[PDB]
RNA sequence: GAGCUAGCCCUGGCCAGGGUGAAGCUGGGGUGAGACCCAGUGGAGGCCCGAACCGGUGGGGGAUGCAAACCCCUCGGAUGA
RNA sequence: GAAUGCCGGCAUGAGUAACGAUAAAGAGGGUGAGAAUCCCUCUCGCCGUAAGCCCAAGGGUUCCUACGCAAUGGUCGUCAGCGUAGGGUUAGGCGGGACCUAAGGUGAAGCCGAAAGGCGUAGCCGAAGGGCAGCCGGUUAAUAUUCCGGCCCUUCCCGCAGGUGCGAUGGGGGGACGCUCUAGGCUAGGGGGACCGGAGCCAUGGACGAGCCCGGCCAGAAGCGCAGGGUGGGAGGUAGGCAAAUCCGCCUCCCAACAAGCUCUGCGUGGUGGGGAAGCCCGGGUGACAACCCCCCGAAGCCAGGGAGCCAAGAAAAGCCUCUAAGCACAACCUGCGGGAACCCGUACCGCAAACCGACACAGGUGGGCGGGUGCAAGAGCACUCAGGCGCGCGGGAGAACCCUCGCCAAGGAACUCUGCAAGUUGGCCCCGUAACUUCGGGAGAAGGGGUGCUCCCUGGGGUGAUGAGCCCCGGGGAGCCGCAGUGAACAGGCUCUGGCGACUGUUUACCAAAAACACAGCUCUCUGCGAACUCGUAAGAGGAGGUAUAGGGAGCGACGCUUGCCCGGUGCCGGAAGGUCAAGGGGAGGGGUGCAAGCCCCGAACCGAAGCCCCGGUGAACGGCGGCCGUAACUAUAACGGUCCUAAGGUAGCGAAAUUCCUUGUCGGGUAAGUUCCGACCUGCACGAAAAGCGUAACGACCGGAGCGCUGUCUCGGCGAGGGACCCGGUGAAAUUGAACUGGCCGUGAAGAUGCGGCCUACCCGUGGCAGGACGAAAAGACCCCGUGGAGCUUUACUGCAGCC
RNA sequence: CGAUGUCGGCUCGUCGCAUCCUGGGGCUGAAGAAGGUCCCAAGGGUUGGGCUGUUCGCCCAUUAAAGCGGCACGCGAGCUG
RNA sequence: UGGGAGAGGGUGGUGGAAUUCCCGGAGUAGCGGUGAAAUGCGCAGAUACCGGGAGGAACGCCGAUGGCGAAGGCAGCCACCUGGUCCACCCGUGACGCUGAGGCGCGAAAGCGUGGGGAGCAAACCGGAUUAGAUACCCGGGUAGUCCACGCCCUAAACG
RNA sequence: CCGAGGGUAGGGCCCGUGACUGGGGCGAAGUCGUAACAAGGUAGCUGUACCGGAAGGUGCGGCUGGAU
């Protein structure tokens, strides 16, 4: 869990890498991969719409099963646990007794060789998917649909989880990884357990180069530019912001809320995120 | 040093060529214009 | 108009030779079991020296130039952002 | 007659600068009207990881031959990439198309936009990626994997035989993949041979030799051999691969497993087809029945889709194989053999350059492969040299100043100067040895030394082979020889102490700044619940992201260490269903116009009425801010203490004459003979201070300071020498500039600095090499400065709008 | 202002004299030696370093002395920067 | 060998009381706080009362002058894993013992690193009083920390 | 060959001294406050943490060498 290096270069001092001790299979399932179109943060106009992106390692996209209500009742075996460079979590290879193979994202504690299954009758067991309606109150859960049959939307980053606080009517009450209290529909699926690779957040990139490998190009501060570029541009020598700190596009960036006020989901958010 | 003209027959025909001109409205008014003026060639000649 | 230049995308190519010697593994020692120590093996690194390649630090020359940015000596990077 | 006018023509500078890398020339013989310059020969020098050779791009006849020399060629020209004419580019296998997909482009369906048009699934296009059948020699003045010769191979059509449930744009398998390191066995290439073939050669003192010099191969179908890659067999069940399925996937059972077998490549061999040197003789002919063998080195290439490790986790589609469905089983497909069929485009030549990009036959720029030998530890480094290719399209003299590039220097050794700028010194390898400090890696090539050649003798280990010889590779010991000197030539660190800034490798103002700037891992704040926020777009649609709070946006800060205090009164943001204000709308007390009137028409109070603002709170790693005066201790001085005025609160730790200190070279101490700089301190900090972060910090730095050692032409202080220019001669022959000129000094005068006016002095006419004081010398209608109700970029609590959001 | 290059240094001088030294004097509160002050005099001479961009100034070691000013704050078609 | 008592230790689970906050209801002019007050909070609907929810920490009565441990120290309840210890029987070994410089391990609180977690409490800090002053005692707030995991620190009126 | 020692270079220990700086001891009658000894007028002592002109205060946990 997080390997360290001796300081035999200036960057190996702090650089840490994952232990990869859970991975059992070091090459992907040929039938479950497809090319990932690297965009560089450029839209169909060719315009950079998200700055500072590009230049990262080539990746194959692994098709992930975020429904699991496709195969209600059909058990699967845990065949392997694999690297996925498109997400922070690890992924899990399932050999269904159907003979079909799919990927899910690996919850914490899932062991290769285990049987998993999905549906209302399913056991409350790490890796099983049920509608939220049927999971006991108080159970930690992950990969949660936000609406019925629309696909797992919540709590899939490494180490994340959502806890079931209670239910009312057709809806259950979840505590999201952010701490928001939200009602989610009881028919929405979810997988009991928390996402694996919890130590993911304790990784120290160590040097600029690792950012470049992840497709992250250098980010240049506003205070470093000229007035034609940014509200914080200009000044003789260094300079404080000299105005409410702002984005490149004018708007304030220290506390200004930006959620849409009349958004129809407000009726289902019970409490705004903690901390 | 490296100068600005680096000829390229594919780049030339695809950028200034007859069919590139005919695709866009400003491309056609170019040909229209050069036809009106009596240009001997409406488009850069390139060997292919 | 991006055949210059800047960034990104797709697909290929290049990086003489030498130097240092991380993790791991093996054996030995150690202990209740360990941490750990030693030797061997090993060959990591925006590691070291240095051609190609990419640069342009100091000085001299050139200044109706060989050249609308060049030449000489010197110098930086050279498995990597 | 003037517009730095416009167009052209012709002058001046001037027979002046220059004639484009300092790799270099000399003679003889030809040709011709004419020759330093063209051809031939001999001698000399230059490149040789190229300055040689082969591809690609771009160029487009420049290629070959004949006949030419007006112009082009920096001179000449009989020559030429120039002029005229004729000739020259040959493919089923090479490259591209009749094949496939990548980004991207286009785009039936569909969506969007005043118009023009913008999107968009499939599909289509799109290559230097995937896929696919030709190798060796000969021939032409000029093409050749293209013609020819030899030996092989692919596809399509039709036929014959044998075989099988045949059949696809649908299902599946495969194609199919990174980085670093790397095994075995080969081949490319190379070194050697006392072996094999060769025309010869004996010089000048010696050698007739196990002498010198030259060469000792290339291609090849089946088969076979060595080395590899790939690959389990059978059965039963089956609900999954959007129909089917005997295929694939999943379960079970049996047998086989570092094998074997089958299959596919590489290398070797292989019938056979080629090639074949020096030297001599006129590209050729001979040599020659040429010989064509043995040993060693050996790839980064081959076997290959090999192996191991690691994280940043490494295209697609077709060919191909298999499964089947419609259909069809007179079929159709598979295998073997045979005949026939096989189209379009490129192919000349240059290609690190005189043919490409730079206006030039321009010291610049241009992607891929081959790139031999010896020595130097290695190598593509360096020196010389092979094959090959050149002497750079003005020359001949002379041997001044001065300039450039270079060599040396007595004594001194930084005294030079803003500065050791520059140039010395050091310099590779092996061995000995190596400090503070430190994040324990480092600092480190620290520093400082010793060794280095040749000869003879003794000897250890490895590779090949066989275990031995030979060859090759690492070494160990002893005795000697020579010189000033043994990395004897060439290539190859000067070192140390101490500050500032920045953690570091990186990045930048293409063309005056490479830095202390930008970036950067890391820290914090903040927004964002997913049709996310945010961004581009009128929109549709995209990016975000096929991601989901361990995630994505924004902002500041900038490894790490120890830390980051007090102020919420104002501005910002956040919270606040009350109150205050508030537009359109609602409401209609009450008025007005008009009509005979019913009516029509107009104004209009109270009152209801959002956001925003007011108001009440919160909030600093939000914008920001963090006092003044007077007095006081038993020497003096200074105030722990106190008084009072003000504030939203009065600067904490740490640091401080600093990249900040004005007075300032503050004062004291160190260093020096002497120190406005430097280092260490003090603290009245003009005008440090805590993420516009404060204080430190090992390592790192073409950053900027100060010192020391070493060593020097930097200097006292200059001298001599070399080559390339300058100078002279023949050839070719510019430029900016220019009112005209018959163009001296002084002292005055003048629009205030006179060759040109006055007075005086001096002065025969014309050049050449030189120096720069003047011609307010040239260049550019001053960038500074001001003026113009000139312009543009930028800012905000300037005005007024607009997008966007509410 | 259709341009008169702006500090200092180096190099190269040349002039003035209100003289720093050397030569000639008078007065002295000049015994001598050595000074002071003033007059005449521009022939010649007027050093090397540390600091700073510096001119200037201070300092070290000397000296007969270590002069002051002008020449576009002399001199960038002479150099530096 | 057969038995016993125990907050000895580690892991996971779980139970109710209370406090704070959130939502709903009902209700009104104060609540709070002290020596006395003020700050603070409350008509924008607090305090007091009822129902519901979230979360943390500590375990009332038993409880004792009690028990366990070498010491530090250990207290709801359940299970698992584990140490020490006492009694009985008189069964086995036959001095196998005592101590212990160095070594190693454990070691309250506070404190440190990286993640969490955060109800109450509370250094710092802010505010109200008191006072000549009040950088205190008292009151209203309040950040580290107190809690969990891993890793350090290794101190004590670590005392009988 | 060894060899007194000389020279070049780098280390280790000790002593003296140094602008300035840190606390310490001592000093007949200084300034500020009153922490401790009585419950010393907030029981004290304590290890540690943070803070403050100064003694000290406060948190956390500990000791009685704490009174009633
Ligand atoms: Mg690390
Ligand atoms: Mg370490
Ligand atoms: Mg893992
Ligand atoms: Mg696929
Ligand atoms: Mg994508
Ligand atoms: Mg598009
Ligand atoms: Mg477009
Ligand atoms: Mg963006
Ligand atoms: Mg981008
Ligand atoms: Mg992710
Ligand atoms: Mg993963
Ligand atoms: Mg829902
Ligand atoms: Mg992180
Ligand atoms: Mg990446
Ligand atoms: Mg980032
Ligand atoms: Mg940045
Ligand atoms: Mg800026
Ligand atoms: Mg800037
Ligand atoms: Mg712009
Ligand atoms: Mg603007
Ligand atoms: Mg702006
Ligand atoms: Mg600004
Ligand atoms: Mg600025
Ligand atoms: Mg400033
Ligand atoms: Mg700036
Ligand atoms: Mg700021
Ligand atoms: Mg400001
Ligand atoms: Mg702003
Ligand atoms: Mg917005
Ligand atoms: Mg929320
Ligand atoms: Mg360029
Ligand atoms: Mg051009
Ligand atoms: Mg180009
Ligand atoms: Mg082209
Ligand atoms: Mg092309
Ligand atoms: Mg092109
Ligand atoms: Mg186009
Ligand atoms: Mg076109
Ligand atoms: Mg049109
Ligand atoms: Mg039209
Ligand atoms: Mg034309
Ligand atoms: Mg025509
Ligand atoms: Mg055109
Ligand atoms: Mg290009
Ligand atoms: Mg390289
Ligand atoms: Mg070495
Ligand atoms: Mg290993
Ligand atoms: Mg490197
Ligand atoms: Mg090195
Ligand atoms: Mg360059
Ligand atoms: Mg240069
Ligand atoms: Mg130099
Ligand atoms: Mg120039
Ligand atoms: Mg050059
Ligand atoms: Mg050079
Ligand atoms: Mg170098
Ligand atoms: Mg290097
Ligand atoms: Mg290298
Ligand atoms: Mg006139
Ligand atoms: Mg004009
Ligand atoms: Mg004109
Ligand atoms: Mg003209
Ligand atoms: Mg004419
Ligand atoms: Mg003319
Ligand atoms: Mg003339
Ligand atoms: Mg002349
Ligand atoms: Mg000239
Ligand atoms: Mg020239
Ligand atoms: Mg040259
Ligand atoms: Mg040469
Ligand atoms: Mg000759
Ligand atoms: Mg000749
Ligand atoms: Mg003739
Ligand atoms: Mg000639
Ligand atoms: Mg001639
Ligand atoms: Mg010739
Ligand atoms: Mg060579
Ligand atoms: Mg051309
Ligand atoms: Mg001619
Ligand atoms: Mg001629
Ligand atoms: Mg003619
Ligand atoms: Mg000519
Ligand atoms: Mg020419
Ligand atoms: Mg031809
Ligand atoms: Mg052919
Ligand atoms: Mg056809
Ligand atoms: Mg296609
Ligand atoms: Mg259209
Ligand atoms: Mg196309
Ligand atoms: Mg195509
Ligand atoms: Mg192709
Ligand atoms: Mg590929
Ligand atoms: Mg082909
Ligand atoms: Mg062949
Ligand atoms: Mg041939
Ligand atoms: Mg098929
Ligand atoms: Mg594959
Ligand atoms: Mg793949
Ligand atoms: Mg990698
Ligand atoms: Mg071969
Ligand atoms: Mg060899
Ligand atoms: Mg089936
Ligand atoms: Mg192959
Ligand atoms: Mg013959
Ligand atoms: Mg290679
Ligand atoms: Mg391969
Ligand atoms: Mg595709
Ligand atoms: Mg039939
Ligand atoms: Mg068959
Ligand atoms: Mg055709
Ligand atoms: Mg050809
Ligand atoms: Mg060629
Ligand atoms: Mg070149
Ligand atoms: Mg090339
Ligand atoms: Mg040529
Ligand atoms: Mg040019
Ligand atoms: Mg030439
Ligand atoms: Mg050229
Ligand atoms: Mg090149
Ligand atoms: Mg050879
Ligand atoms: Mg070498
Ligand atoms: Mg020449
Ligand atoms: Mg040349
Ligand atoms: Mg020439
Ligand atoms: Mg001469
Ligand atoms: Mg030269
Ligand atoms: Mg020499
Ligand atoms: Mg000599
Ligand atoms: Mg000398
Ligand atoms: Mg010296
Ligand atoms: Mg010396
Ligand atoms: Mg010096
Ligand atoms: Mg000098
Ligand atoms: Mg300088
Ligand atoms: Mg040297
Ligand atoms: Mg050297
Ligand atoms: Mg030292
Ligand atoms: Mg040092
Ligand atoms: Mg240090
Ligand atoms: Mg160390
Ligand atoms: Mg060494
Ligand atoms: Mg050395
Ligand atoms: Mg020796
Ligand atoms: Mg010799
Ligand atoms: Mg070096
Ligand atoms: Mg830096
Ligand atoms: Mg920087
Ligand atoms: Mg710093
Ligand atoms: Mg730092
Ligand atoms: Mg680098
Ligand atoms: Mg620049
Ligand atoms: Mg510039
Ligand atoms: Mg420029
Ligand atoms: Mg420059
Ligand atoms: Mg700069
Ligand atoms: Mg640099
Ligand atoms: Mg920058
Ligand atoms: Mg940095
Ligand atoms: Mg940080
Ligand atoms: Mg954070
Ligand atoms: Mg926009
Ligand atoms: Mg997407
Ligand atoms: Mg940094
Ligand atoms: Mg930065
Ligand atoms: Mg430290
Ligand atoms: Mg405030
Ligand atoms: Mg406030
Ligand atoms: Mg405020
Ligand atoms: Mg109204
Ligand atoms: Mg302000
Ligand atoms: Mg303010
Ligand atoms: Mg007094
Ligand atoms: Mg304070
Ligand atoms: Mg503090
Ligand atoms: Mg100071
Ligand atoms: Mg000072
Ligand atoms: Mg400072
Ligand atoms: Mg400064
Ligand atoms: Mg300051
Ligand atoms: Mg100062
Ligand atoms: Mg000053
Ligand atoms: Mg001084
Ligand atoms: Mg001193
Ligand atoms: Mg002072
Ligand atoms: Mg500052
Ligand atoms: Mg600042
Ligand atoms: Mg430092
Ligand atoms: Mg340092
Ligand atoms: Mg650097
Ligand atoms: Mg630097
Ligand atoms: Mg210096
Ligand atoms: Mg020095
Ligand atoms: Mg000289
Ligand atoms: Mg000469
Ligand atoms: Mg002539
Ligand atoms: Mg001519
Ligand atoms: Mg005249
Ligand atoms: Mg005249
Ligand atoms: Mg005259
Ligand atoms: Mg005259
Ligand atoms: Mg006047
Ligand atoms: Mg005059
Ligand atoms: Mg005159
Ligand atoms: Mg006149
Ligand atoms: Mg007159
Ligand atoms: Mg006159
Ligand atoms: Mg006159
Ligand atoms: Mg005269
Ligand atoms: Mg002359
Ligand atoms: Mg002359
Ligand atoms: Mg002159
Ligand atoms: Mg001049
Ligand atoms: Mg003049
Ligand atoms: Mg004038
Ligand atoms: Mg002048
Ligand atoms: Mg002049
Ligand atoms: Mg004008
Ligand atoms: Mg003007
Ligand atoms: Mg101008
Ligand atoms: Mg300017
Ligand atoms: Mg200006
Ligand atoms: Mg003015
Ligand atoms: Mg005005
Ligand atoms: Mg006016
Ligand atoms: Mg104006
Ligand atoms: Mg002017
Ligand atoms: Mg003019
Ligand atoms: Mg002018
Ligand atoms: Mg006298
Ligand atoms: Mg006397
Ligand atoms: Mg006397
Ligand atoms: Mg007198
Ligand atoms: Mg005189
Ligand atoms: Mg001075
Ligand atoms: Mg001056
Ligand atoms: Mg001064
Ligand atoms: Mg005297
Ligand atoms: Mg003067
Ligand atoms: Mg004057
Ligand atoms: Mg002047
Ligand atoms: Mg003046
Ligand atoms: Mg002046
Ligand atoms: Mg002057
Ligand atoms: Mg100048
Ligand atoms: Mg000057
Ligand atoms: Mg001038
Ligand atoms: Mg300057
Ligand atoms: Mg300069
Ligand atoms: Mg009230
Ligand atoms: Mg009310
Ligand atoms: Mg909570
Ligand atoms: Mg239980
Ligand atoms: Mg017994
Ligand atoms: Mg004991
Ligand atoms: Mg504790
Ligand atoms: Mg108060
Ligand atoms: Mg009072
Ligand atoms: Mg402890
Ligand atoms: Mg006790
Ligand atoms: Mg001696
Ligand atoms: Mg007390
Ligand atoms: Mg008391
Ligand atoms: Mg008291
Ligand atoms: Mg007390
Ligand atoms: Mg306190």
Swiss-Prot record, chain A:
Residues 229-239 have a biased composition (Basic and acidic residues). Residues 256-275 have a biased composition (Basic residues). Keywords: Ribonucleoprotein, Ribosomal protein, RNA-binding, rRNA-binding. One of its GO terms (cellular component) is large ribosomal subunit. Residues 222-275 are annotated as: Disordered. InterPro entries: NA-bd_OB-fold, Rib_uL2_dom2, Ribosomal_uL2, Ribosomal_uL2_bac/org-type, Ribosomal_uL2_C, Ribosomal_uL2_CS, Ribosomal_uL2_dom3, Ribosomal_uL2_RNA-bd_dom. SMART domains: Ribosomal_L2, Ribosomal_L2_C. One of its GO terms (molecular function) is structural constituent of ribosome. Part of the 50S ribosomal subunit. Forms a bridge to the 30S subunit in the 70S ribosome, contacting the 16S rRNA. May also make transient contacts with protein S6 during translation in the 70S ribosome. Belongs to the universal ribosomal protein uL2 family. This is Large ribosomal subunit protein uL2.
Swiss-Prot record, chain B:
GO terms for cellular component: ribonucleoprotein complex; ribosome. GO terms for molecular function: structural constituent of ribosome. Residues 29-48 have a biased composition (Basic residues). Keywords: Ribonucleoprotein, Ribosomal protein. InterPro entries: Ribosomal_bL34, Ribosomal_bL34_CS. The keyword Cell membrane does not apply. The keyword Coiled coil does not apply. Belongs to the bacterial ribosomal protein bL34 family. Found on the solvent side of the large subunit. The open reading frame (ORF) for this protein is entirely within the ORF for the RNase P protein (RnaP). The two start codons are separated by four nucleotides. This is Large ribosomal subunit protein bL34. It comes from Thermus thermophilus (strain ATCC 27634 / DSM 579 / HB8). The gene is rpmH.
